[PDB]
Design a protein around this ligand. Structure first.
Ligand code: GDP
Ligand code: GDP
Ligand code: GDP
Ligand code: GDP
Ligand code: GDP
Ligand code: HSX
Ligand code: HSX
Ligand code: HSX
Ligand code: HSX
Ligand code: HSX
Lengths: 294, 309, 309, 306, 308, 309
């Protein structure tokens, strides 16, 4: 049967997942030692169980990554039948190639540390680059928020039939042209001094990318989109990291709303920013766990 | 502890140019097929203690050349070679780099694992379809760019290059073309299939389509037709990998290109004989230089700012 | 009860016979090639939690079938199948199982490592060239014998079998023929190349050459004529693997065989059209029984003493 | 090959001291964190064909320094280094070296395997909590001793060292002090919970263990040693973790000195605690690096110091 | 539930028989001998397809022959399509070589752990590892069982003055073990380290406790020191009864009232030639570990209680 | 630049000493004993840091203690920062268990190859593997040396009538070993098969030489010898590479009808020669020493297969 465990990163999403599966949380004490070493004490048997550990790459990332690895190692030495790392926001994903001299491929390093910890399956959401599925030798589910983003647009944008949907960088063109084609609307591209390609005159601009970290690029992209004359600017990003001065920049930018999923906890950031709206996706992870559980 | 260079049956000319630029001959290897079509590899010289480089591109009957490459690596490895480096100009199975459909394979990662398990210690390639294939291994992977030699070609061959527009034939290729456009200080544009859509205005100016490869060339021929319809003085196509499979030559001859420019990661002499529009950017000096720097133990970053020769 | 059988492009007939004998349908898989000759594999039905068997024989265009097999294994493995078993009746690269020359590869071990790294958990094959290839893995390898079905054939079709002579065309095929001689209670003989030399009798007796495979068939045709010039009644040739590459068919048409008997580890339908001496032994029930017993607990030890049907 | 030594963000002073003692400068690495708290590592000079040494101790925010160390190892490995050696003065997660509870992790082995897959070919550390951690790998792991340097400190600083009594504050540490007391040919003692076994009457008492974290079990162990009547009490621990309430407890305790090595930085601790003294072990690590480079035996560093 | 098979090696057949008997099973059909040239011969005479296999081999009596036999049995079961192969090793061999305390020294214990891993072992069940950190040699579950509950029950039921005894360590290495026992009995402890004794064995009973007894030189010299310090009776309760070389002669001449070991190593032949040696059948602790590991329960019971 | 060291195990110190003498080296400082409880104790009393280490241990005389000793020495040198560890094993143990011929049978040879691999061996140097395919049980270079040269030289220098002798295989499995030797001598050949013992070939009126790779209990060579005399041969010799002579072997050869029984010193023969006057030994220490010298440097060992230094 199923045991779902939660790490100290995003207890809310784990609770939603376990509720949707009709389970309890697997009882785990997750803290730090006096000298900041990660302390993981699982307080119930997992012998013969299919265990799922929910830990997102957010907060103090290395503590949560190491916590996840230690939970995997404990469950593996605990004679668990299978250990699955549920990672809604995959850490170190932007370091997925050697783009400069002597650079590390940190995402690949993370994939190998999960492998040697004892992970048998990975369930994640909107990988920055899909090719990260190839960093392993085990099944890696790359889930999409695209149905939930489409539904959010259709249910919240009055003028969605005549929007355009825009990318703030180059790399995000393929992500955008999908949903633009799925809504049957135009599309546009913003590149870095900032240049705009496409027609967003007298319509609604929805910026879409996989992630929003410092939000400098989407804020200057919204400013370019107002320069080109757009009745309203939205930003729908899957992972709402919001690091550093991000909140200040979205509060001063001219967005109608800024939409993210709950791959990362947003309550405290939503308290300091009124434009933020969060989507479900917890039902998408539960169905990947239940589908995985044969 | 010097260099031994061997050639596979997938591109002996490129191996010949590389060994020539390095002041070498090429290793004595017989690479044929058995009566029942099994690969036969006979290394005809000692390779003990040598730094071996094997040149095999993903082209032709791809699985025969891939299997030949793997057998060459394994023989050299149990031949007590000091190091074995697979130089793979066009990396095969690169478009199968993820699990997009329901039960699809990641063939590129499988290939990376067969190269790893054969005994490869180093990979030297050019313009990987996805750069993340460098992460499919646990060994160094040089992802060489043809971008500098393409820039040099454009400047030395395009009269109106100062006011051209670099166009991406698909969505996915926007990063490449904005890189090149930023390097020439020109404009860029994008074409998206669905009717085919053009964004970025290429009116009354030269249009250069740039992507990593040309297989069946349907997408770049349709893109070129759209560039004419939008009113573009001239339309070029500069692609790194000249696969040209199927009706590709028919489609390029029946399109409106002034030239279609590729590198010699794949043999092009037979293709150029049947298509007066195809131009080749010899990149054997970039591969020869990367091998030499790899041997000495020097930094290959020079190869991303300047063209040799 | 959770069993799936997928077929490659090499021996679809044998796959259908096996699935028929197990009362199953073949799994939904599209297995073709891309425009640039890369292998294209989409398994079109779930294998989640299933006991998967992939039947691909080492024959035809061998490297395309090997890559197809590896891509199917890796796909099923990433598709969360419980176990993936490669049913390979004729093992490719099996004759390359040692280092006899100064720089030779052990291609059989390379293949064992590529099947292992793809995700294979079990191997089911028939009459390995060398049995020690079982040790090239680290997973169970069922090496089935055609010996019982050959014994049944010899008993039921050769009238003078009680006083025949089982002959080896080379050395090393001595154990194969001595086991059949001890099991039929008959005589054995041996032929060594070096002008060919025969040791043993065959005078005024039916002669039966037995080996594991027949590729170019030069040695068994010269062996046949030597057996007639030593004064033998007839000459048969019973080989497990048909292959028949190169000029083999032409040579069998001119040789003096009464019959050439093979199993259907390799398709023989096209071969039988051009050679009237070729008779085929259906071994689909031995492979089907290996699969059904492998699914359940049940020991495969049957398939080495008596024939299923 | 030629030697390059790199520093992590943990204990930069020890890295500089080591590089100076080897007559080298530290290599160019920028090691910081991203806006979203991910580790950023940029090695700014070629290491192709080099024998690289990366000095990172298990201290401070340990998971950030461990993850940073792993990223440096991986970068140097893809940067075509000839050999990558992790110099780790204090090995993190070492106290998780066995399974004494249900569902417990063996975090020390997890770290050993992450170092292995990162690309480490050699490990140089000092006084592992348990020596058997050398077996968590399949690559050379040097477990150096501070014992000659603590002995030299104690002969050179304790006048009554000829007639002292070395004490273990817990059970598990009974062998270490027998290795040291017998090396001084002096009395030894033991404390368990507190009850004391061994003599400590009018003698002066020297606590020796591998660590001292929060120091509760050595502050109480000092109180028991005074109650049994010893002139002064000395605490000599290898790794100066001093986390949590450690400083307050030593400031309110009756130590003559608390001596640690510089496997972990102590400067911030020493400005706030007059009782902390540090032993320089930078030459003991430098000599193992030098011997490891040009192929000598580090056995000498367990009996002679520099 | 029952798809389990249990097999024996050539080392401790009595323990194998007791374990299988306690589980209500018969021992599996394996012929285990040596070839003419002294190579190990292993013939499993029954199917293990889909089975949860347990192989009982202790590190004792011609160690390399039994270790190599164990590895060959694991590999045979692995190629025989067993679902899981568990090595039950009551006394884990080469455990004293668990670190590098010398130049050019081997970690023989780690080598053995890697040979068991590469042979095909999926699980290890052992008792009183010399060092518990050997659990970290394996990357697989390793049960490190204790004789501590059975040693305490034996003490309470056989030492009358056990409430005022003295649990003594024969070397500096058993201080963790004996304090544990000392705390469980609520008694005093002592240590012996040239003969130096620290602790107060007053005029009472001294019980030496360690993990094993090989030659028995240390427990006997510790017994002499415990005499000279004036102690009533002295005992020795050791988990692993290796007793090699002149060990029995030295126990017969030493001042022991009794010397108690477990049956991780065969002791019947040893007990016939020494009236002092007593054995604590621990076959039920191993059987209940096999039974719980099959059908997947928690073995932590076995450290608080002694099932018969 | 000699970084070469050479240790010896407890199995064959004489052969190690001859090898090191021929290489102009001293034997490495190793104490190899047993603990009180019969556990293997290995203390290397010399640095091997950065050295090319060779450990000479043969599979003979109490196999498991010598195998375990070899493994502990490899592991010690590997953790001792040795540059490379090469296991020089003249007689490779467990070679006869190289396949699964019965149900639940072990492939002990592959297990041994995996324990040598996991100990840290980078190279294996052996002589006359029972099956050559055992080279594929590894993933590291394995030199399979032949005793065929020096056996040819022995026959020529000791048998007067060798120009018309007959090389006989005692079993159906050594026929390839025989056919080789005979072709190099240009002599007849024959084969013996225990079915009742049967002889195939001609050995009437001329000298007969039984040749196989080893002699364990010697049960077959002796009955084959009486068969060779009942079939009428002047003399009978027995030349085996590996002189194991276990069990009743010496008792059987002393009453056997051999002119001589010739073995190599892959196994110590001194005590065996004391109890059997018919035993001749061939020194192959120069073939092992040359395999080591060429393996160290970087030279083709393949000379050793037709020359005899
Ligand atoms: N992972 C895990 N280990 C268990 C469980 N139950 C028992 N163990 C065993 O417990 C041992 C270590 O903890 P344990 O002995 O129970 O703690 P102790 O009884 O206080 O010494 C190992 O042998 C584990 O195999 C369980 O449910 N999960
Ligand atoms: N790879 C390689 N192998 C060599 C070389 N020189 C000798 N060999 C050896 O040659 C052997 C195979 O060639 P050969 O002696 O003709 O085979 P054999 O006579 O049938 O055993 C192998 O054992 C190799 O180790 C060399 O330069 N390279
Ligand atoms: N192999 C396999 N993967 C599946 C199956 N069903 C769903 N998936 C996975 O589910 C994911 C699809 O979700 P998404 O891309 O967000 O639409 C893919 O990554 C697949 O790997 C199945 O039947 N087989
Ligand atoms: N790790 C490492 N990579 C190097 C070194 N020298 C050159 N490189 C190469 O630098 C390449 C980076 O390519 P690119 O994305 O164009 O970065 P660029 O070299 O700065 O232009 C990598 O693919 C490496 O092959 C080196 O010393 N170490
Ligand atoms: N290990 C094992 N092998 C089995 C079992 N049942 C059948 N086998 C087969 O046994 C074969 C070798 O033994 P066997 O068939 O009896 O003798 P053979 O005539 O040499 O094939 C292998 O090819 C296996 O496929 C089993 O339960 N366990
Ligand atoms: O373009 P499609 O033929 O649709 O897809 C494959 C394309 O691959 C290359 O980009 C060619 O230009 C082909 O057109
Ligand atoms: O030897 P060839 O005639 O050329 O090739 C076919 C032979 O291949 C093997 O030797 C078989 O015995 C076949 O008779
Ligand atoms: O003392 P408490 O258990 O906090 O733990 C801290 C101890 O950690 C080690 O034992 C040190 O000697 C410290 O005294
Ligand atoms: O006493 P020794 O002969 O030195 O060695 C064997 C005995 O002492 C050792 O520590 C073992 O524990 C045995 O108890
Ligand atoms: O005669 P056996 O008992 O079979 O074994 C000893 C034989 O072992 C070898 O294979 C030779 O044929 C020897 O004569």
């Amino acid at each position: 049967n199923i045991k779902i465990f939660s790490g100290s990163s995003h207890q809310d999403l784990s609770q939603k997942i376990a509720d949707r599966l009709g389970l309890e949380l697997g009882k785990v004490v997750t803290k730090k030692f006096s000298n900041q070493e990660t302390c993981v004490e699982i307080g119930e048997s997992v012998r013969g169980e299919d265990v799922y550990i929910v830990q997102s790459g957010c907060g103090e990332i290395n503590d949560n990554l190491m916590e996840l690895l230690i939970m995997i190692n404990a469950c593996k030495i605990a004679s668990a039948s299978r250990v699955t790392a549920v990672i809604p926001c995959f850490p170190y994903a932007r370091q997925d190639k050697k783009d400069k001299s002597r650079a590390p491929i940190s995402a690949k390093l993370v994939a190998n540390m999960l492998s040697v910890a004892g992970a048998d399956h990975i369930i994640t959401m909107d990988l920055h680059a899909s090719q990260i599925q190839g960093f392993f030798d085990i099944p890696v589910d790359n889930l999409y928020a695209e149905p939930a983003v489409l539904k959010w647009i259709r249910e919240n944008i009055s003028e969605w039939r005549n929007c355009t949907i825009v990318s703030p960088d180059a790399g995000g063109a393929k992500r955008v042209t999908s949903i633009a084609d799925r809504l049957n609307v135009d599309f546009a591209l913003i590149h870095k001094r900032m240049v705009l390609v496409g027609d967003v005159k007298d319509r609604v601009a929805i910026l879409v990318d996989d992630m929003a970290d410092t939000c400098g690029t989407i804020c200057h992209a919204a400013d370019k989109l107002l320069s080109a004359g757009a009745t309203r600017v939205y930003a729908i990003l899957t992972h709402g990291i919001f690091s550093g001065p991000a909140i200040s920049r979205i509060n001063n930018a001219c967005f109608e709303a800024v939409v993210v999923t709950n791959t990362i906890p947003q309550e405290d950031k939503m308290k300091h920013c009124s434009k933020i709206q969060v989507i479900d996706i917890s039902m998408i992870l539960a169905e990947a766990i239940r589908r995985t559980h044969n």
